[PDB]
């Protein structure tokens, strides 16, 4: 299974990936580029493309769209200023023809932080209810603990 994981910078995309691959919480640098890794979960081998979220790189995601079976969209639940921006990025991503049938999994992340928005709140802000054309799911996660990560891999594998 081919997976594209994106989201704004600092959402926790690489932390998620290497928690999944190494069972370890690594010390990230901003990703100017991608990381690509293969992860085994329950007889599925997920090839995850973690593509950096800062602006220059954001402009490049479209090259990773093609062949994508599922999309992990990571959100920093503690950052309320950038939630609209996330909504804007994700909405036009939903309009992409190469992403047309891909399974849509939102991770509301850093759920560990006291003022993190809830997954329900995030669902309203991102406009997730309005997707009728394909599968979507939202999952509260904490990438450092590992909470919600495998519930994500589970949902994804049931595409």
């Amino acid at each position: 299974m081919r997976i594209l994981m994106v989201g704004l910078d600092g959402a926790g995309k690489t932390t998620v990936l290497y928690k999944l691959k190494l069972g370890e919480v690594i010390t990230t640098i901003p990703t100017i580029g991608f990381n690509v890794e293969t992860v085994q979960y329950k007889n599925i081998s997920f090839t995850v493309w973690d593509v950096g979220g800062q602006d220059r790189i954001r402009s490049l995601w479209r090259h990773y769209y093609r062949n994508t079976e599922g999309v992990i969209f990571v959100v920093d639940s503690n950052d309320r200023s950038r939630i609209g921006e996330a909504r804007e990025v994700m909405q036009r991503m939903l309009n992409e023809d190469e992403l047309r049938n891909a399974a849509w999994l939102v991770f509301a992340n850093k759920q560990d932080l006291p003022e993190a928005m809830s997954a329900a709140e995030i669902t309203e802000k991102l406009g997730l209810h309005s997707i009728r054309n394909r599968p979507w799911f939202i999952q509260a996660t904490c990438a450092t603990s590992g909470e919600g990560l495998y519930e994500g891999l589970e949902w994804l594998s049931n595409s």
Binding site: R2, I32, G33, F34, V36, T47, L60, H63, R66, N67
Partner: protein, 550 residues
């Protein structure tokens, strides 16, 4: 072999999910083949192929890694959004094995620009110090490329670069010292410190010696602070290692511009250093030479002479014979000229085609360059006119004529006149233009102009426009300078030849009308001797020098 479009296109699958190291590596090989076989990539498909390949860097296979380095460098400039490949190259570069190490630094650094410079530095510092020549040399050449993008990053590497310099391993040293000289330079003195450190040493690295000789060739006496001598204890002034190229480079500079003076075990003022290497095989070519030497090329010239002169005469092989002429030319000088001229006379007999033109030019050219009299030069210039009769050209008419009017003019015209007896219209536009121009300009009283006129009259009929036009205008000037001449001008110009052709007519109508009709204030003014259209330098001799041993 291949089609560039199909191969550039099918590469786009990498960009999606398929990575298949075998298939992609093949497709890459094909790209390298399109360039190698000689083809030009199409930009859209190239740009697409480049973004696709970066995915392929995930799979670490030594052949796929290799394909990827050559292909990204070739496709780098005819591609967009190339920046993504830097990370992948660093990942590869730190991976231990020469296949990755050396080839990656080179591919990475080529794509790398001043922003990216910072990233490659840790990996670069690790790769430069290597006494494993691939990694270190690739990293050293890589640093040279990077001096452009950003100087400062490269400069920090001077310590790692120096560290490589201390190897006696040929590559690691050649690259290390060569690169260092370029890098650390902020003033002469800091580079000079780098050179003195290696300088006292008897290397077994010929390439390092050579690259360094060049830095060294000028007198440096500030190497590592200061020192009391231009000294180079590495062959430049020394002859610690014998090997005919290094020996030649060193010997020609040192002799009359000491990098150090002569030592019993290392001649460096005396002519010797070249000469002991001089009898040899194909190898001889460096050895046999000269250039400069104490106090002249001539005492030097005698040693080597047996070698240069026998090959030059015997070998009608182009490859040997050329080395033999260059070597003769090198052992040459003012003195040598007697000898050089007989040999060059002889040489055309071995290779005679262009080489013929060159020897008849050379014997004249050498006489002008090295004085055996200016007259003899003209006499050689006659022999050139005789032998070739057509590989003289237009530039020759101007150069021969200008040169000639220094002394030769009355003779030259006369010689020319005789020379014109040759061949009526195969002699070319140029000879006719030379006898015509000279007979016009001198206005012979040395011989009767009537032979000259009769000779030129026939040539014009069947030869090109430019000479026939030349002939009318010359005649007009010839009229203005000498009154006597006017009757011949009239028989010639009424003819369908010297006037009334095409270009010849237009010029003639003007030139004629000014002589015939008009005051000749203009005609008089116009002839100041009846000189050429331009006065250049003496073009032939340099031309001839390179042209002969080609």
């Amino acid at each position: 072999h291949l089609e560039k479009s199909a191969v550039l296109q099918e590469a786009r699958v990498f960009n999606e999910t398929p990575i298949n190291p075998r298939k992609c590596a093949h497709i890459l090989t094909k790209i390298l083949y399109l360039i190698n076989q000689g083809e030009h990539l199409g930009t859209t498909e190239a740009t697409e192929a480049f973004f696709a390949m970066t995915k392929l860097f995930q799979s670490n296979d030594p052949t796929l890694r290799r394909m990827c380095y050559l292909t990204i460098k070739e496709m780098s400039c005819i591609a967009e959004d190339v920046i993504i490949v830097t990370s992948s190259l660093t990942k590869d570069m730190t991976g231990k094995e020469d296949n990755y190490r050396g080839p990656a630094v080179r591919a990475l650094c080529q794509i790398t620009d001043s922003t990216m410079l910072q990233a490659v530095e840790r990996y670069m510092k690790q790769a430069i110090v290597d006494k494993v020549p691939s990694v270190s040399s690739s990293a050293l050449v890589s640093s040279l490329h990077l001096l452009k993008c950003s100087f400062d990053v490269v400069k920090r590497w001077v310590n790692e670069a120096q560290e490589a310099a201390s190897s006696d391993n040929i590559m690691v040293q050649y690259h290390a010292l060569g690169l260092l000289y370029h890098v650390r330079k902020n003033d002469r003195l800091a580079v000079s410190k780098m050179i003195s450190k290696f300088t006292r040493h008897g290397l077994k690295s010929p390439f390092a010696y050579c690259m360094m000789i060049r830095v060294a060739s000028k007198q440096l006496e500030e190497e590592d602070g200061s020192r009391d001598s231009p000294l180079f204890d590495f062959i430049e002034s020394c002859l610690r290692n014998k090997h005919e190229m290094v020996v030649y480079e060193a010997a020609s500079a040192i002799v009359n511009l000491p990098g150090c003076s002569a030592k019993e075990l290392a001649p460096a003022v005396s002519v010797l250093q070249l000469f002991c290497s001089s009898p040899k095989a194909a190898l001889r070519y460096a050895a046999v030479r000269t250039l400069n030497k104490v106090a002249m090329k001539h005492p030097s010239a005698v040693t080597a002479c047996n070698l240069d002169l026998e090959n030059l005469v015997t070998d009608s092989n182009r490859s040997i014979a050329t080395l033999a002429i260059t070597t003769l030319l090198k052992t040459g000088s003012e003195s040598s000229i007697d000898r050089l001229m007989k040999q060059i006379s002889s040489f055309m007999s071995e290779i005679s085609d262009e080489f013929k033109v060159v020897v008849v030019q050379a014997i004249s050219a050498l006489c002008q360059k090295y004085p055996r009299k200016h007259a003899v030069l003209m006499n050689f210039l006659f022999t050139m006119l005789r032998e070739e009769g057509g590989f003289e050209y237009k530039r020759a008419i101007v150069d021969c004529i200008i040169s000639i009017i220094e002394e030769n003019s009355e003779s030259k015209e006369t010689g020319l006149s005789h020379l014109c007896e040759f061949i009526e219209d195969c002699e070319f536009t140029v000879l006719a233009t030379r006898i015509l121009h000279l007979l016009g300009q001198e206005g012979p009283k040395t011989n009767n102009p009537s032979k000259y006129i009769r000779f030129i009259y026939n040539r014009v009929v069947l030869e090109h426009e430019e000479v026939r036009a030349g002939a009318v205008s010359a005649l007009a000037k010839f009229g203005a300078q000498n009154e006597e001449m006017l009757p011949s001008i009239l028989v010639l110009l009424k003819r369908c030849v010297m006037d009334d052709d095409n270009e010849v007519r237009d010029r003639a109508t003007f030139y004629l009308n000014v002589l015939e009709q008009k005051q000749k204030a203009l005609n008089a003014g116009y002839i100041l001797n009846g000189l050429t259209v331009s006065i250049p330098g003496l073009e032939k001799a340099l031309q001839q020098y390179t042209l002969e041993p080609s």
